[PDB]
Symmetry: C3
Subunit: 220 residues, 3 copies
């Protein structure tokens, strides 16, 4: 037998860790189990667009609790919380939250303009009421969306968003949600100082994570 040098063992362990971590991340990605399909949320919320946004939200929540038992928060853990980011302000009520998927009801009663953000997640907004103006990166034109339509904010893409008065939509997102949470709390920390809103957002996220962990370990 023979020995191996220290700097040689450095590169050897580097290669070993590289192989192990790459194959482990691949085995991780291969076992990803998305609960909601890429277009299920939109194809369901379109069936309620045009109603009273309160009635539409209630019916959508009942339908999502019926179709996916164990992945929608209870009536007690539903709470509207403000959200300030990229210069815009709205309100959200979270229904489903995990490390890859999230579902919520987003909206604003006054309207707002701002920067959508650049993060690693594909997000779908199905308009229940109001208008949605979108300005894509590198254009001089604005695209308007009305109730029924669905806006797909793609990963990497950066758009200027504008919601009109009484705008209300159903949002579903899939990707690296922790990467969204950095942009999520920027205006809360450096503008509004509304730390109770920060706590409410983090508590809703923790409640969604706990519900998903419970349904994973025991479920049904």
């Amino acid at each position: 037998q023979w020995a191996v040098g220290r700097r040689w063992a450095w590169a050897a362990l580097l290669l070993a860790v590289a192989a192990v971590l790459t194959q482990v991340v691949w085995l991780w990605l291969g076992t990803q189990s998305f609960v909601f399909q890429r277009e299920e949320i939109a194809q369901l919320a379109r069936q309620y667009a045009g109603l009273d946004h309160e009635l539409a939200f209630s019916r959508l929540i009942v339908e999502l609790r019926r179709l996916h038992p164990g992945h929608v928060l209870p009536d007690e853990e539903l709470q509207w919380v403000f959200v300030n980011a990229g210069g815009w302000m709205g309100a959200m009520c979270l229904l489903h939250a995990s490390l890859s998927e999230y579902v919520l009801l987003f909206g604003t009663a006054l309207g707002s303009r701002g920067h959508s953000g650049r993060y690693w997640a594909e997000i779908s907004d199905t308009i229940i009421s109001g208008t949605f103006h979108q300005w894509r990166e590198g254009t001089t034109k604005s695209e308007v969306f009305y109730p029924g339509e669905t806006v797909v904010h793609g990963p990497g893409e950066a758009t200027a968003v504008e919601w009109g008065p009484n705008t209300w939509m159903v949002e579903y997102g899939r990707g690296v949600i922790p990467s969204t949470l950095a942009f999520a709390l920027a205006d809360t920390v450096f503008s509004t100082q509304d730390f109770l809103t920060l706590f409410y957002t983090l508590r809703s996220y923790a409640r969604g994570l706990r519900l998903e962990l419970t349904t994973y370990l025991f479920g049904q």
Copy 2:
């Protein structure tokens, strides 16, 4: 020399007792409905003429508690995403009075400070969207809107909106929300200095009035 270390605690307890008693024995210069009616009177006038008449009547009703014309100054306010301007008439650790507004209009956060705010509208519109609600409320010239302590709303001021404002609470707590966007969005340190100087002038006026 241990007693020398404990004597500071003794004197500090005595000083805190004095401060507590003085905070208990504290009267307020202005009342809510006073400012409300005074502002609703001048609602139908031009906003500049209304401001002038209101400053005149406030100096009449409360001398020594309103700033002089040499220390009156319009200063911008960038906070919670919204932008406006204000002119501070009176300021203390407990109360403040100022004319506020915006000529272009704005939308943004309301703030979560330890103070009750009262905005009486001279011109324009005030849209308020309360926390946990899905509808909005509107206030037209002459009406008064109260922003409670520890409450967060969404505010929207239309074009050419101007109002009178009177707040009562722990005013130093409202200062953290006051300089957030000034440092992290506009970097307008001249306006920051102007705001701090207006607050210092109000404190100086109140001190020299209470002391002579």
Copy 3:
């Protein structure tokens, strides 16, 4: 005799002092021939000729004419990129056509409109409107001015205004002064609001391209 003869070391030190004085005097003349590539309000007098048309054709023809007029000082079509611009609570987009330490030229605007704070930098900014509206609110007043297609907004050095842009606003912009002071404020929201570091990279790279073009033109 000895009357006209001069020593050598004295002459050496005298020439050193003379060169020192001459250089310290001609360093002042660095402000004597400013030679601004654009004669005061030339950009406004130019852009007022193409403002009536659609904004894209106007932009194209303006870039063509400006490359004709001052060649070598305008970026080529390979380095013309629209970049989002968030600052002072407002959002728009820019396309840089000229960049230097004393002056800059670009095309600015937004499709959705935006309101916010102008900024307190050492610069005289000239925003010449091509399409849309401009609303300016000067400091100390309670009224506002409005500017329509064909006019020019002059943002003075050290001033501070409230800026508003309506829907489909597009203008050209030319500014003199210490541009790094403007750049310090230009990317504050990008750090503390949008957190779009890719846009920060794009804007800094565009400024670097402008500086490189202006450097390799004075040396060639």
